[PDB]
Amino acid sequence: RYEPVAEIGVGAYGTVYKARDPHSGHFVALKSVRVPNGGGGGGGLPISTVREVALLRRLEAFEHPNVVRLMDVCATSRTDREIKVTLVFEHVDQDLRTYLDKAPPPGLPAETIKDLMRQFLRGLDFLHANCIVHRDLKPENILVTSGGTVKLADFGLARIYSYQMALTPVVVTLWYRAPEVLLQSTYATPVDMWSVGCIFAEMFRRKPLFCGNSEADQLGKIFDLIGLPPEDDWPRDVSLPRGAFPPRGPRPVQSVVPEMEESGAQLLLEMLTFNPHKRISAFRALQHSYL
Amino acid sequence: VDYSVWDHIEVSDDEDETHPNIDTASLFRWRHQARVERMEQFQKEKEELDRGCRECKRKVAECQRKLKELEVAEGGKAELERLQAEAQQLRKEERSWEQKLEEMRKKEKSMPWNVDTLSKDGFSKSMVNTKPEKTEEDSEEVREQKHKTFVEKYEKQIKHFGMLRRWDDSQKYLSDNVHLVCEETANYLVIWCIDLEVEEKCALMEQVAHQTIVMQFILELAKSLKVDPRACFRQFFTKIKTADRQYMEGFNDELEAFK
Amino acid sequence: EEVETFAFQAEIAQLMSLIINTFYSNKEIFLRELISNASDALDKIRYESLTDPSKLDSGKELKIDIIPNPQERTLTLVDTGIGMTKADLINNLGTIAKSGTKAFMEALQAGADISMIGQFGVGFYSAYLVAEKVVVITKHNDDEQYAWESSAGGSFTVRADHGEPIGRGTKVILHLKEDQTEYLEERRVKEVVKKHSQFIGYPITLYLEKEREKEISKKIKEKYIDQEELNKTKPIWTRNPDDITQEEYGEFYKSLTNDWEDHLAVKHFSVEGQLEFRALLFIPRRAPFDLFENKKKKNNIKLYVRRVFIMDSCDELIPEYLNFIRGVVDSEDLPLNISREMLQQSKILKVIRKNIVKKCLELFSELAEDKENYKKFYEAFSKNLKLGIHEDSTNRRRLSELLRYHTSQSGDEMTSLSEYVSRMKETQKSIYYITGESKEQVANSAFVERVRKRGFEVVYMTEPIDEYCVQQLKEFDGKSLVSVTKEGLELPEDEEEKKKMEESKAKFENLCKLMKEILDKKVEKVTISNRLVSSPCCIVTSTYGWTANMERIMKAQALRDNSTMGYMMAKKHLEINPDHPIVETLRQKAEADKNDKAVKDLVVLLFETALLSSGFSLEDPQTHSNRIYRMIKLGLGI
Amino acid sequence: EEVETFAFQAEIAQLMSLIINTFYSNKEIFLRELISNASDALDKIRYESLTDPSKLDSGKELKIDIIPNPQERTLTLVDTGIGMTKADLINNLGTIAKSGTKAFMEALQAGADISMIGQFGVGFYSAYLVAEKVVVITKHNDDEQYAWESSAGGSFTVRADHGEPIGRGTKVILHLKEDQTEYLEERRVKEVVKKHSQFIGYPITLYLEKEKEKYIDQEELNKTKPIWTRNPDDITQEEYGEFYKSLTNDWEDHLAVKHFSVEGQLEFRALLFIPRRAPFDLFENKKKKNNIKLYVRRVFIMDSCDELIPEYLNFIRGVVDSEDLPLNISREMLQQSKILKVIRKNIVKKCLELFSELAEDKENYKKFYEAFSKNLKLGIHEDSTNRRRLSELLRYHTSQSGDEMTSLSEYVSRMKETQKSIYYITGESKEQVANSAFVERVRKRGFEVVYMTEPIDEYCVQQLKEFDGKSLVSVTKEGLELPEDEEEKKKMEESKAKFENLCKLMKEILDKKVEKVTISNRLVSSPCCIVTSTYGWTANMERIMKAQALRDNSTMGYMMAKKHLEINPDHPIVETLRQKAEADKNDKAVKDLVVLLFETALLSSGFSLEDPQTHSNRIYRMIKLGLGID
Numbered sequence A: 001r002y003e004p005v006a007e008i009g010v011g012a013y014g015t016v017y018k019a020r021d022p023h024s025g026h027f028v029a030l031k032s033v034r035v036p037n038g039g040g041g042g043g044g045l046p047i048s049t050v051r052e053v054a055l056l057r058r059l060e061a062f063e064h065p066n067v068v069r070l071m072d073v074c075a076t077s078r079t080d081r082e083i084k085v086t087l088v089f090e091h092v093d094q095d096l097r098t099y100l101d102k103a104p105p106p107g108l109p110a111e112t113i114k115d116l117m118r119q120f121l122r123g124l125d126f127l128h129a130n131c132i133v134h135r136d137l138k139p140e141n142i143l144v145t146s147g148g149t150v151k152l153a154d155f156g157l158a159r160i161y162s163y164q165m166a167l168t169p170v171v172v173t174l175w176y177r178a179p180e181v182l183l184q185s186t187y188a189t190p191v192d193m194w195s196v197g198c199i200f201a202e203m204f205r206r207k208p209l210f211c212g213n214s215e216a217d218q219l220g221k222i223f224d225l226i227g228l229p230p231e232d233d234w235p236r237d238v239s240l241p242r243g244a245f246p247p248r249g250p251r252p253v254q255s256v257v258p259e260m261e262e263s264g265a266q267l268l269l270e271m272l273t274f275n276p277h278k279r280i281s282a283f284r285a286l287q288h289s290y291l
Numbered sequence B: 001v002d003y004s005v006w007d008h009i010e011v012s013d014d015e016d017e018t019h020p021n022i023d024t025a026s027l028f029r030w031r032h033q034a035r036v037e038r039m040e041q042f043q044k045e046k047e048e049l050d051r052g053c054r055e056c057k058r059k060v061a062e063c064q065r066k067l068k069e070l071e072v073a074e075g076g077k078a079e080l081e082r083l084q085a086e087a088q089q090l091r092k093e094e095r096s097w098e099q100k101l102e103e104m105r106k107k108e109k110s111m112p113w114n115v116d117t118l119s120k121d122g123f124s125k126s127m128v129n130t131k132p133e134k135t136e137e138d139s140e141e142v143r144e145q146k147h148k149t150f151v152e153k154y155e156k157q158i159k160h161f162g163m164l165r166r167w168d169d170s171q172k173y174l175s176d177n178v179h180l181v182c183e184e185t186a187n188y189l190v191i192w193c194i195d196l197e198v199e200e201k202c203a204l205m206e207q208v209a210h211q212t213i214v215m216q217f218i219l220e221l222a223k224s225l226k227v228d229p230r231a232c233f234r235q236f237f238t239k240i241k242t243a244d245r246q247y248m249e250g251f252n253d254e255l256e257a258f259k
Numbered sequence C: 001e002e003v004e005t006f007a008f009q010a011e012i013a014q015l016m017s018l019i020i021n022t023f024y025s026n027k028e029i030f031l032r033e034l035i036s037n038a039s040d041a042l043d044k045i046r047y048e049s050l051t052d053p054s055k056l057d058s059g060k061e062l063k064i065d066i067i068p069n070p071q072e073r074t075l076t077l078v079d080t081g082i083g084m085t086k087a088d089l090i091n092n093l094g095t096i097a098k099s100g101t102k103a104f105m106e107a108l109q110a111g112a113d114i115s116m117i118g119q120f121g122v123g124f125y126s127a128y129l130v131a132e133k134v135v136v137i138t139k140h141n142d143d144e145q146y147a148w149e150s151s152a153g154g155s156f157t158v159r160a161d162h163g164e165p166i167g168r169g170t171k172v173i174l175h176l177k178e179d180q181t182e183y184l185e186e187r188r189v190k191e192v193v194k195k196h197s198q199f200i201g202y203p204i205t206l207y208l209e210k211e212r213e214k215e216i217s218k219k220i221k222e223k224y225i226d227q228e229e230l231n232k233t234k235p236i237w238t239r240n241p242d243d244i245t246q247e248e249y250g251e252f253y254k255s256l257t258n259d260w261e262d263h264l265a266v267k268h269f270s271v272e273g274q275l276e277f278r279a280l281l282f283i284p285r286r287a288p289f290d291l292f293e294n295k296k297k298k299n300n301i302k303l304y305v306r307r308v309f310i311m312d313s314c315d316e317l318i319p320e321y322l323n324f325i326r327g328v329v330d331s332e333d334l335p336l337n338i339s340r341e342m343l344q345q346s347k348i349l350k351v352i353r354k355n356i357v358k359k360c361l362e363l364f365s366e367l368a369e370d371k372e373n374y375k376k377f378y379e380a381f382s383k384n385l386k387l388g389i390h391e392d393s394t395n396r397r398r399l400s401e402l403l404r405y406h407t408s409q410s411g412d413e414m415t416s417l418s419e420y421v422s423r424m425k426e427t428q429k430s431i432y433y434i435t436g437e438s439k440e441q442v443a444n445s446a447f448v449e450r451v452r453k454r455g456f457e458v459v460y461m462t463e464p465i466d467e468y469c470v471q472q473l474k475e476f477d478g479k480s481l482v483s484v485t486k487e488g489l490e491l492p493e494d495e496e497e498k499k500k501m502e503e504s505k506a507k508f509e510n511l512c513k514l515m516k517e518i519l520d521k522k523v524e525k526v527t528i529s530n531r532l533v534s535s536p537c538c539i540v541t542s543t544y545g546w547t548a549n550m551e552r553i554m555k556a557q558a559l560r561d562n563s564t565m566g567y568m569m570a571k572k573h574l575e576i577n578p579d580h581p582i583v584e585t586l587r588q589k590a591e592a593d594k595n596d597k598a599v600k601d602l603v604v605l606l607f608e609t610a611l612l613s614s615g616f617s618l619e620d621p622q623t624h625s626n627r628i629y630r631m632i633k634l635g636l637g638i
Numbered sequence D: 001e002e003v004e005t006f007a008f009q010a011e012i013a014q015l016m017s018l019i020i021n022t023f024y025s026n027k028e029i030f031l032r033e034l035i036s037n038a039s040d041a042l043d044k045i046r047y048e049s050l051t052d053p054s055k056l057d058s059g060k061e062l063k064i065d066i067i068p069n070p071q072e073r074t075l076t077l078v079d080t081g082i083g084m085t086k087a088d089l090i091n092n093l094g095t096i097a098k099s100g101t102k103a104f105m106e107a108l109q110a111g112a113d114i115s116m117i118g119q120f121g122v123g124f125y126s127a128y129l130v131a132e133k134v135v136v137i138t139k140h141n142d143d144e145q146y147a148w149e150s151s152a153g154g155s156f157t158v159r160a161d162h163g164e165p166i167g168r169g170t171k172v173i174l175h176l177k178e179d180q181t182e183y184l185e186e187r188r189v190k191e192v193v194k195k196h197s198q199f200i201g202y203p204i205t206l207y208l209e210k211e212k213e214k215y216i217d218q219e220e221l222n223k224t225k226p227i228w229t230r231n232p233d234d235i236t237q238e239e240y241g242e243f244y245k246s247l248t249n250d251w252e253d254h255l256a257v258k259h260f261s262v263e264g265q266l267e268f269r270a271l272l273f274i275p276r277r278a279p280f281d282l283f284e285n286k287k288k289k290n291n292i293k294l295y296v297r298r299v300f301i302m303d304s305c306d307e308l309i310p311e312y313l314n315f316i317r318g319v320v321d322s323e324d325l326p327l328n329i330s331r332e333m334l335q336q337s338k339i340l341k342v343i344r345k346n347i348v349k350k351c352l353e354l355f356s357e358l359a360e361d362k363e364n365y366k367k368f369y370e371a372f373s374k375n376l377k378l379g380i381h382e383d384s385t386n387r388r389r390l391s392e393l394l395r396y397h398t399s400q401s402g403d404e405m406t407s408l409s410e411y412v413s414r415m416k417e418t419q420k421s422i423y424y425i426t427g428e429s430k431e432q433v434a435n436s437a438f439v440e441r442v443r444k445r446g447f448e449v450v451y452m453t454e455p456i457d458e459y460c461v462q463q464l465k466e467f468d469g470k471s472l473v474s475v476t477k478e479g480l481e482l483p484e485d486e487e488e489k490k491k492m493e494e495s496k497a498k499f500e501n502l503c504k505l506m507k508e509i510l511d512k513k514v515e516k517v518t519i520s521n522r523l524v525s526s527p528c529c530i531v532t533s534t535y536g537w538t539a540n541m542e543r544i545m546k547a548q549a550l551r552d553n554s555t556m557g558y559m560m561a562k563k564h565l566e567i568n569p570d571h572p573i574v575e576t577l578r579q580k581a582e583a584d585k586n587d588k589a590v591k592d593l594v595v596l597l598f599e600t601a602l603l604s605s606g607f608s609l610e611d612p613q614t615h616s617n618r619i620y621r622m623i624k625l626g627l628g629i630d
Ligand SMILES: Nc1ncnc2c1ncn2[C@@H]1O[C@H](COP(=O)(O)OP(=O)(O)OP(=O)(O)O)[C@@H](O)[C@H]1O
Pocket: C033, C036, C037, C038, C040, C041, C079, C081, C082, C083, C084, C088, C092, C093, C098, C099, C100, C101, C102, C117, C118, C119, C120, C121, C122, C123, C124, C125, C169, C170
C-alpha cells in the first residue's frame, strides 16, 4: 500500500524495502515473505502469516514505539519468494519426429521449413567449424522447440545410445542416410546435408522422401529423384557394386516434394545429388536467398 | 612476462563456446570423445614409430656387427661393401623413424593443455566429520567458567543485541554473532534490564526486554526441538515473520512465561 | 643529509614484455586497436583538410583496408590516414606511453569536433600478442616514406623508402605467430571487427580470396571479396532526434539485432551534462523465447565509447526488469582503464542507469497514449512490468500506472487502474479485486457475488506475478486495494441489512459452533458472511498473507521447501451463507439433533467442497471421491 | 645506411600517470601491494638468516606494522625487512617495472623453500592511487639509513635519515590525499586486510588509538593461518573444524573436509568443505558466489564460484591456493579463464569422490542428503556428464521401505526376475501417492514403487530414463505394464467387449472432456481414474509448471498430454452403468452420473478442475435432493 522509495538490508523478511504511507507519510519496513496457501493437511488460506502481519499491524496500532513492522494489512510482495528468488527451467522434449506427427499433411508451410532449415544449417556451420562428426544424425536427433528452434544432438554412435536403443539402427530403412553412408565411406558436410535434405523433404511431405531395403536398394530409390549415372560419377570409397546401377533421369524435386519452391528444390537436389562433391555446403545453403 | 605456456588449453565442457541450434548436453560429450580418440591415435602413432626405429636400430646394429665380421672374413670384404650399403639404408631408415619421432615431439609441444596433461592428483585426502564421540558435559560446570568470562568478553555485544528492534537486524546480528545464541546471553539481558530499571533507563529497559524475550524465544523451541539454538535461531525469525497475530502473541505469552 | 634528486627510471626490457603479456587477456583487441589508430590518423586528415583542402592533394579517399596473406601468414592494414614522419616513428611510435593524439588534443583548438579515440600511447605494442613482428611503412605529407620495423625485442629500426607507393598514411605489416593463423580466416576476422569496429566513421573493407566456381569458363566467378559491408551500420544517436525518421531508425533496429521487423517502441536519450552521452532505447514487438533465461549473460544495452564497443554490462547499465530494451549508449567522456575493457569508477554507470530508466519510464508513458500499440507492448512485456513493480521500489509510482486489468465492469476490455479509480463510486473507497487460476474461475467465484450485488467493480487477476503485485500494490490513486477473497471484506452496505446479518448470526449461532466442532482442526473459524449468494459456504482467506491462488504458485515454484514457512503461514476460515437452503436446513437439522453424524458428515462434505470451490486442495482427494462414490452407490441402490 | 637502429624508449612522465590512473581500478589494494612487498622482504631475511643467522642481529622479528595517523592524515607502514641500500632505492624502488625480488629469486635458484611474488615491478606505485606523497625510509643491513621522498612527480629524492633509527627494513609514509581519509578508519583497514591479507605468512598488526587513547597493537589482525599449506596427514579433525569455522564464520563445524592438490603445469593446493546444514539463502539468484575462494601464493585474487564450481555444487566451502597463475598486470584478474574450468573439473571429481565416501557413512550421508538432495537433483537436471554418478547418490522412499529412503540401486536389487522397469509415482505428498489408485494394482501384483514427492522430481525424473539397465515407468501414465496372466488377459478382453458400448456411451457423454474411455486392471478400489498420455506433462507436472510466474503459456500447446478415463469393470457402479446403458443409454440421470464420476475421478486423480464452483453446485444439488430441499 505504501509508496516504496528505498531499501532496507536483507534479513528475516528478506529484502526489506522502505516506503511511505500514501496518506500519512509514515515510513515503513517493506517486509516480505513467500506466499503459498494450503498443503498435505488440506486447504487453508499451517499456522498464519495471514495474521502475522496482523501482528505487525497490531504493533503499529500500539505505536510500543520500537516496532519495525511489515507494511500494510497484507504480507506484501517486496521481493518475495521466502525470501529468495530462484528459477528452474524445463527441458524441451519436442522431437522432430513428434513435430512431424503434430505437423499437417503434405505441403508443410515452406516458410516454416525455411526457418527451421536455416536454423539447422546454421547449427551445422557451428558443427563444421568444430569438426563435429555425426553421419549417424537422423530425424529423431533433431529437436524442434515450442519457439520453433532447431537444436541438434547425438553426434554419432560413439557417444549416443548409452541406454536401451534400437536393434536395427542401420538395418532400418536408411532413407535419411547419405549415399556415402550407403557406400560405407565416411562423414562429411555433404553427408550431413544429404541426410537432412531428405528430412526437409519429409517435412514438406510429412513423409520420408525415399524408402528402400538394402543400401543399394536404398540408392535405387534415391536415384529415381536425383538421377543416375554408370561407373564414371562414383567416389572411390564404394562398397556397393557401382556400375551395376542402370542409369536413369531425375524427377524435378520441385514437383515431387509438396510446396517445394524451385530455389529450395535446387538446394535439395544439390543436397541429394549422389556425388558428395556436387553438393552444396551448409554455409552456402544457409546463405542462399531461399532462406 | 611470459604466460604463453597457457595459451593453448582445451576444455571439452567449455560452456562459453556454444550455439543456439546445438544441444551442448551431448556436444560436450562429443568433445570428450574426440579428445580421447585423438590421444589414442597419437599414442598409437608414437609407439609404432618408436617400434620401427628400434627395429631398424637393431637391424643396423647387427649389420654393423656383421660388417666387422665381413671385414675380418678372408675375402668377405666384397660382401662387406654390399652390407655397408644395406646397413647405411637401415641407419637411414632408423633415422627417418627418429625424424618422425622428432615430429611427434613437435606434436607434443603443440598439444593442448587439459586435465590429463596439465596436472596429476598430487594429493588427495578426504575426511568425514563423524563423532566427536557420544558424550555430554555438565552445563552448570561449563556455565561456572563460561557465564563468568564469556559474558564479560562479549558484554558489549550482548548489549548491542539488546539495543536492536528490527526483526531483520536481529536475525543478521545473530547470524554474524552466532556464538551469542545462548542462555548466558539471555541471563545478562535480564540482569541488564534490572540495572536499567535502577538507573531509570526504562525506555532502553523495555527494548532490552523485547530482545531478551527474542533470545529466550530462540532457546524455547530449540529445547522443544532438541537442537542446538545456534543451529536453528534463524528459524525463529522465520517463525516470527510467519506466526499468527493471535498465536504469535500467544507465542509471546508462552515466551514471556518461558523467560 | 645532502638531498640528491633522481628522475624516475623505467626498465623497458621488462616493461615492454609487461605491455604485451600482462595488459590484455583478450587478443581480439589486436584488430580493434590497429583499426582505432588508423581511424585516428584519418581524423587527423579530416581536420587538416578541413582547414586546408590542399592537404588532400596526395589523396582524398579516407578509409581502412584489411588484406590477409595466408601464404605468408601475415596481415596487412592499410591506413589511408595522415601517417607519420620519420621523427614520429622514432618518437611517437617507438616510445612507450607516447601518443601524437595528445598533440592534436592540444593543437586542435579550432578542431573541437575532431575526437581522437583513446590516448595511452601503448596500444600499438599489443600487436605483438599475435604477431611475431610488425613493420609500419608510412609517409606523412611532411616527410618521406619510411619503414619502421621491430619484433619488440628491446629495439626498433627505421628504413628509407623502399618504393612501395605510400604517399599517405601507413602500411602495417603484421607477421602472425605460427599458432595465430585463425586470424587469417574470413569468419574470424569478421567476428572480431563486428564487435569492435561496428561504428567506425571511416569504412573498413576486407580483401579476401573469393569463394568461386572453378575458373573454367564452363563457368567462372569473381576472384576477390571487397567486404565494405562491415560498416554498413552507422551511428544514429549522433544525429538530431527531430531529424531522425523511422525510414532509417527502424532500419537501425533491424540491424541492431537480427530482427526482420521494425521495433515496437523507441526513445532517443540525449545527455548534455557531465556524463555526456546519447542513447537509443528499443522495445521489440514481441518477447524473446529466452526472455526469462536469467542463466544467460545480458547484452541488450551496450556501452560504446567514442562509438567503440567497450562494455555490455546490462547488469549495471539497466534494471533486470528492463532486460528487454535493446540499445546503444555512446559517451566520449568515460574513464576507461589501460586495457579499455572496463570502465573505472562504476558509480558513473550507476548515474547513467538512473538517467536511462527515467527515459524508459517516459517512453512507457508515451506508449500509454497509443492504446493499440500499448496493449501490444503491455501484453508482450506485462510480466516485465510487473517484475519492475515487484523489484523496483522507487519507480513503482510510474510502473503501477502502466498496469492494465480486466474487470467485472470492463469485461473483455483490459483497462487502467486509473480508469478503475476514476469510475469508483462515492462509497467505493477501496479497489476490489480477486486473484485466481483463471478469468472464468474468478469471474464465477463465490467471493465476487455480493460484491457485484453491491455494484462494485472487481479487478480480475490470474498470473502468479499478479499474485505478487497484489501483495505489493495495495493502493492506487489514494484508494487501497481489498481482495474479495479475504476476511473482513467491508463492502459498503445498508446498516439495516447488517442488522439482518446479526440476527442471522444469532439464528445460525449454534450451527456455526457445531460446524466448528465438526471441523475441529480442519478450520479455525466457522462464521457468517453475506459475500456469499449462491453458495452455502465458502472457505475464505484472511486479511493478510497466503490466498487461494498462492500455494499453486509458491509451493510448486519455489525450490526451497522451507518447511518452516510451509508449516507456519496459513489458517482457515469458513464463511456461511445464512440464506442458503442447505444452511437453513443444516440449522434445522442441528436443532433436530446436533449429534446426527449424517449431518456432521454433510458438513464435512460441504467443507471439502467449500475448499474446492474456493480453489483449495484437499488433504486426501481420494477419500473425498470415496465419499462421492459411496453417495453414488446409495443413489444407485448398491 | 638504409636503416637506423634505435632502442625502445619510454615516456616516463606519461607512463607514471598511467601507472597511477589507468593501470588500476580499485585503489584500496595499495595495502595489499605494500604489505606483499613487506612479506617478500621478510622472506628475504628468513632466507639470508638460513645461511647466516647473525643477519638477525639487527632485530630478530619478522612482521608488518600498520600505524594510521589522522593528525597528519597519513599512514605509517613499518616493514621489518632487510631494507634497501641507497643504490637499491635509486635502482629498484625508483625504477618502473623493476624489482629486486627477482634478483633475490635468482639467488634462491641455489635451492630454497622461499616463495615470493613481484614479477611486475610496479606494485609500489599503487601507493599513489591513494597517497598524494610517499616517503620511504630504509636502513639496509649493509648500508646507512636513508629517506626516500617523492610525490610521483617524475622524480624522487634520497638523503640520509636522521633521528629515529631503523635496525632493518623500511617505513612507508603515505601522505594520504584529503579525500582518502576513509583509509584511516579501523573498519576500512580491516576490510582490506580481510580482503587480500587474510593469509599473509607474516604477522600484520594494526595500531589503533584506543584506551588513554594510545596505539593498541592489534596482533590478531591476520591471525588466520593457512591449512592446505600444511601436511594434511598431520592435520587433525579439530584443526580442520577450526579452519572451517574460521573460513565460513559458522559456529558449527563441517560435515566433511577434503584436501586436494594437483601437480604439473597446473599446480595448487586446496581444502573442500561440506557444511552440515544448508544456508537460508542457498538458492538466492542475487547471492554472491564466493563459497570457495581463489588464491595465488596465499594472496587473494578472486572468488568467482560462478565458474570455479557447478551451480548445483554451490554450497561447498573452501580455499584453492595456486602456486602460479597468469595474473594480469592487475592481479585482481586472471588471464586464460579456461584454467579455472580445468580446476573446476578436477574439483568436481573430488567432490563426487567425497560424496561417495560420505554415502558410505550412511548416517552422515542421510543428514547430508536431507540438507542437499535438492542440489543433487539440480545436478541431475543440469549436468549431462556426471548425472550417472549423481544418480547413485539419489535416495527415495519406496513401497517396501518405511520412512527410510533407499537408493535406486537398492530398488534394482529388489526387482523381480521378470521386472524390466522401475515403478514410481510422483505427487505433492507421500500419503497422497501412497493412497493413489495407480499403485494399488501394482501392490496387488507385488511391486515396489518409488515415491517422489518433491516438485523438482518432475525435472529429475525427466532425466532419469534408465538406471542400472532398468527402465523407469510412471504408474500415472497410460501403458502401465503389470504381469498379465493369459487367463486374466482373456477375461479382460471379455470385459472389454462387456463394457464396450458402455465406454462408447461415456465417450459420447464426455466427448470433449476425455480423449479415450477404456477399462484397465491398474485400478483396484476405484471405479475409474484419469491417466496421462506418455506424451506431454503429467498431472503433477502440469500443476507445477502452471505455478511458474514467468512461464510462457503458449508452450502448453506442445505439453497438454491427453487424458484418458480408466474404468474398473469390477465395481458395482461400473456394472450398474453397463446395465443402465442397456436399459437406456439415453438416460439423462445416468449421463449426469457419468459426468459426475469423471469429474470425481479427474479431481481425485490430481488433474486441474475446470470449474470448482459448478462441480460443487452439482454436489449442492445432490445434497438438496438428499435433504429434500428441492
Ligand atoms: N596507423 C597509424 N597511423 C598513424 N599513427 C599511428 C598509427 N598507429 C600508431 N600510431 C602512433 O601511435 C600513437 C598512439 O597510438 P596508441 O594506440 O599506441 O596510443 P593511442 O592510440 O593514443 O591510445 P592507445 O595507446 O590506447 O591506442 C599515435 O598518436 C600515432 O603517433
